[PDB]
Amino acid sequence: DVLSGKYKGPCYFGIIPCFVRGCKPKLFDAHRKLCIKLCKQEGFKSGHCSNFFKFQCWCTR
Structure with missing residues (x-):
């Protein structure tokens, strides 16, 4: 699991x-x-929202 493929909001x-x-x-x-x-x-x-630091978006292979 890492910070998306390119960028997010x-x-x-x-x-x-x-x-x-x-x-x-x-x-x-x-x-x-x-x-x-x-x-x-x-x-x-597989992408979802549950981190609460400063973006709330996470993607896994």
Whole structure:
């Protein structure tokens, strides 16, 4: 388990403008679907929010 594949942001409940299936409805609802889609593009498969230091996103092979 390491800090994502390239880079990530805060947990909250959805905020980005267009990136995956939630572009037309806006706000992803939970950071677990945005954390897995950015790290799985380089070489990963399991992403989640539970660290509380200064980012709240973790990905594992």
